[PDB]
Amino acid sequence: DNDNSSARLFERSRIKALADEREVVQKKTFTKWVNSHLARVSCRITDLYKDLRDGRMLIKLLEVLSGEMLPKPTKGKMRIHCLENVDKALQFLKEQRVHLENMGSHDIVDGNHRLVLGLIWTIILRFQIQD
């Protein structure tokens, strides 16, 4: 009743505000870090959530960081081709033995904020850049 209302107020204010504040700052930092490396191909992202859905930009970012030749992106405009491209990127990440948990193609395609940010964080932390 009234105590439930107070608990709802406490969680909705504090937990949500702290969480999305941290996501906003980390999202800006990660967007700048990705845009630093993506200028070689002359590709630029304005929003981290929206631009990674089709999977082409993730493939290009892995192309820049790894320095190797990933397979062909699938020529398409549908949802299936986006799933295919994101799955190709995740398979290349599995090739380097980078350990991802709760990472699926449909999660990246659907635009989940937490999983995209976690994937970018795992790219920054665990993956190593070839020169």
Binding site: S6, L9, R12, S13
Partner: protein
């Protein structure tokens, strides 16, 4: 005819999206104000209980 109609449909969609964006921002501000006011109510209620 179709190329004539698509312009009007696109313009209506764009202006509907703008209205949605400003309504969402106003809703966010109203929710924050309501939460602050209810917390201010709780403080005085606890003081009266003591």
């Amino acid at each position: 005819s179709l190329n004539r109609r698509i312009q009007l449909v696109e313009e209506e969609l764009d202006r509907a999206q703008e209205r949605l964006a400003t309504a969402l921002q106003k809703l966010e501000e109203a929710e924050k104000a309501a939460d602050e006011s209810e917390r201010g109510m709780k403080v005085i209620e606890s003081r009266a209980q003591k």
